[PDB]
Every structure is written in C-alpha cells, then in structure tokens.
Design a protein around this ligand. Structure first.
Ligand SMILES: [Mn+2]
Length: 492
C-alpha cells in the first residue's frame, strides 16, 4: 500500500541487505521491513595477484540471488547493489560484476571508499545520536574509513588499506609464545605509518564524539559487555548504542593475544570471528588511540542505511520539482510498477542532455521538454507497449517505445503516422532518452552530465558517476543520437 525499497552492500567479509518501506509524508524516512547478512568472504577468495577467484564469483552470485528472491517476497522489486573494497580493488572486478549480473540480474556496482564513508556516516546517523562534532571509524574486512562531520552529514573522509582481512594476511602470526603480541604490535605500527600524515583531520578535540560501525566493532562491544557482567548482545536486543572505553578495548585485545587461535573462537562474543579478530582489534585500538579517543559508541547502522536515505532523498527531491501533470506521470508509472528511482534519474539526465543541446544552438519545439520528461518516466511501462493533450500523448508513447522497426508495420492497419515534424521530433527526443537510460543502466542513481560539447560534426560527453556498465550502455544506445545529432564520444 506504500513504496517498498531494497538496497544491499557487498563488502570484503560479508554482504548486507536492507528492505524497507518509505514513511508517509515524503519526509525521507523509512520503516525497516527486513534485514539480511551474507558471509561472502570475498577477502578470502582473492588470489595472489588480487583477483577474485571463481569461488568468490560463485559466492557473490549466490548472495545476490538470496537478495533477489527476498525483495520479491516483500514486493520490493529491484535491488540496488553497491560494492566496496574487494571488488573495488580486484583487477577482474568489472568482469566479475558483469558475469554476476548475467547470472542473477543484479550488478554489484563499485563505489569509491570516500562515498562508502559518506553513505556509511548517514547510516550511522539513522542509528545513533550525533553531536556537533563527530568522528566515525568504519572497519571492514578490506579497508578502514575515517569520517568526520556534524549532526547531518560527513565533512572529511579518509579511506585506508587497513582492513581486517587484509591485515591478517599481511602480518602472518608466528609460532612463538609472544607470536600474538608481535602480530598486534606490527599491525599497530602499520596503522600509525599510514594514518600519520592525516590524523589531525580526525584527531580528537574538545567535545568530539567517536563512533564505530560494522561487524568487528559490533563484535567487540558484545564481548566487552559480557566481560563487564552484562548478557550477550542477543539478549538486550541488539548492540546498537553501547559504549565502551579505550581501556576496556585495550584489555580485551591483551586477552586475545595471549590465546592461541582455536581458543579465540571460544571468547564470549567473538565466536563467529576468530580468524581475523586479533588484527581487527589491533586496528581499532591504534586508530582510536592515534586519534586521542577515550570512549566510543557502536552503531548497527552502516553503508546500507545510508543508501536508503540517499535514494529516498533523490526520489523525493525529484518529485518536488515536477508539475502536477508531471507528478501524475510519476504516480501512473508507479501504478505500472516501475522503478521510480530509475525513472527519476533517467528523466533528470535527459533534461541535462536536452539543456546542453539547447544551449549549443539545437532547435526544438516548445513542448519537447515536457514530452521527453514524461517518456523518460514512462520508458519502462510494459502495459503501454492525466494532463497532456492527445497529439502530445501519442508523441510521448512513440518517444517512449521507439524502435527503428516500428512495432506495427507501415502497410499494416492501425499504423500511427505522425506528421513529418512530429516523426522528426520523436526521433530527436528518443535519441536523447537512450543516452540517459544508458547512463543509469546500473541503477545507481549516481550519474551526472558534466560537459557536453560539440567536437566537429559530433559531440563529446563528459559524465561522472558512471560504472563500466553505464558507460558501455551509453555506447550501445546512442546509435539513434548519432543519426540525429552526430557522433558522440563519451569520456571519463
Ligand atoms: Mn530503463
């Protein structure tokens, strides 16, 4: 009876899914419907050259299919999937992602570490109480993000190759009695080396609050509470918002370093994380200590909650700037079961491309922009192959379902032949619409047109926020653009 949305993130240790329903009032809020975690362990499926092995590909695809079936179970539809360090850093990442889409329909789109921090920071904001000056450390299996901001959003973000999986493999544990201490000591030195040039950006100042997210930080809080006399985090509901001190953090690591690995699996609260936990806890202590932290709060919110906020922000921001007639287009598309985020992004990019063409001296009729907006919103309505007149809606439908071969053949009855100027208009506006659809082929909502310039008889389009799938999609669907506007080279 209300919008249901699915977002998921693919990390280095595990993958995480969130399905939620928007809250009424278009206030950018959501109600949680369901959550899932997947032990993908890509960081353990990376060969010596940094490539994801076929085993990781099998494990990735399986995760995204679990995700794909659950979204349907909740009427959520499409799943937006972002990918971080393992896929970001794998030389074969793109090929793995392209293969996974073919097998699952879902594409793990890589984002930079910096966007990971910003989105992660928003997700924490949904879970805990932030103040005027906050530093977040997000330790995953692959990387460590540092994020500083205030009560609403991230300001400065740093991503470092200090992930837990990465550091465990980088500092192999010896067999001495003190082999554990030596590992913890060595990991702590690497942290200082890489963090030293930037730590001031994230160093504690009077009143600063420190926060931790993700499974290692969550795991540390559970073990610390059970050592303070508390019950396991499953009891007490969850671990969200628990505080512990740097001294308590220091005390937990010392116990682990003295134990051998099989006994680490038997520490209360660390039962499912024994293999990387020594290095992960060395990472947390050194960075917090290097920042001057004395006490932290753990957040169960992370990357996926931020994705949810951002998509709602994108959709609802789009909705405000549309006319009542255009607002009725989005609802109709909604009644057709279309993806509004995809529809909104394609329409925004279409306007972006239309406007640059207009600025460059292209001539278009007055209602052209209106028709393109609606067909961009309607381009994925399967039923049709509220405020618009009948020539215009036939134009829109013909723009929305354009093909070089017209579905009804020209001698065949019911062939709909618009006037010559309208035939020409359909082709020009349809050519614009294909490039924009290609630019959000990956459904990231992240693409933007930066610069579109004439280059001889053609055009050169500079875009940001594009995935390899988006860039190849634009290459594939601009054939009509080429017939009407000339060769297009896309860059960056
Ligand atoms: Mn589409």
């Amino acid at each position: 009876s209300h919008m249901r949305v699915a977002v998921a993130d693919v990390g280095t240790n595990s993958s995480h899914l969130l399905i939620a329903e928007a809250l009424p009032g278009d206030a950018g809020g959501f109600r949680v419907i369901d959550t899932l975690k997947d032990r993908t362990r890509l960081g353990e499926c990376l060969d010596t050259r940094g490539e994801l092995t076929p085993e990781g590909e099998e494990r990735l695809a399986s995760a995204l299919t679990r995700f794909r079936e659950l979204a349907a179970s909740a009427g959520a539809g499409d799943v937006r999937v972002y990918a971080t360090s393992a896929l970001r850093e794998a030389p074969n990442g793109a090929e793995v992602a392209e293969r996974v889409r073919q097998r699952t329909g879902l594409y793990p789109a890589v984002i930079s570490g910096v966007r990971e921090g910003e989105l992660t920071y928003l997700g924490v904001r949904e879970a805990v109480e932030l103040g005027p000056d906050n530093v977040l450390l997000d330790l995953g299996g692959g990387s460590l993000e540092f994020v500083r901001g205030a009560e609403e959003r991230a300001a400065d973000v740093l991503s470092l190759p200090l992930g837990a999986i990465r550091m465990t493999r980088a500092f192999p544990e010896g067999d001495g009695k003190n082999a554990g201490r030596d590992v913890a000591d060595a990991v702590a030195r690497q942290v200082r080396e890489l963090l030293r040039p930037h730590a001031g950006r994230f160093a504690a100042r009077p009143g600063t609050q420190f926060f931790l997210s993700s499974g290692t930080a969550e795991a540390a809080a559970d073990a610390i509470a059970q050592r303070r006399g508390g019950r396991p985090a499953e009891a007490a509901g969850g671990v969200n918002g628990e505080r512990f001190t740097l001294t308590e953090l220091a005390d937990l690591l010392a116990h682990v370093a003295r134990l051998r690995p099989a006994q680490r699996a038997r520490v209360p609260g660390l039962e499912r994380r024994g293999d990387t936990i020594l290095a992960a806890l060395s990472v947390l202590h050194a960075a917090l200590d290097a920042l001057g932290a004395r006490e932290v709060t753990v957040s169960e919110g992370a990357l996926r909650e931020g994705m949810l906020i951002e998509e709602l922000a994108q959709v609802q921001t789009f909705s405000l700037a549309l006319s009542t007639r255009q607002r009725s287009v989005l609802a109709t598309a909604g009644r057709f079961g279309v993806n509004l985020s995809h529809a909104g992004q394609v329409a925004e990019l279409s306007r972006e491309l239309f406007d640059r063409l207009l600025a460059a001296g292209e001539t278009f009729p007055p209602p052209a922009r209106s028709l393109l907006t609606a067909a961009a919103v309607l381009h994925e309505a399967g039923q049709i192959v509220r405020g618009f007149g009948p020539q215009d809606i036939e134009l829109i439908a013909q723009i929305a379902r354009y093909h070089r071969k017209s579905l009804p053949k020209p001698s065949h009855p019911d062939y709909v032949a618009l006037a010559p100027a309208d035939r020409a208009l359909v082709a020009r506006l349809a050519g614009i619409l294909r490039v924009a659809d290609g630019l959000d082929r990956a459904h990231t909502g992240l693409a933007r047109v930066d610069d579109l310039r004439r280059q001889g008889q053609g055009w050169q389009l500079r875009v940001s926020g594009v995935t390899p799938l988006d860039l190849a999609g634009v290459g594939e669907k601009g054939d009509l653009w080429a017939r009407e506007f000339g060769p297009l080279s896309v860059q960056n």
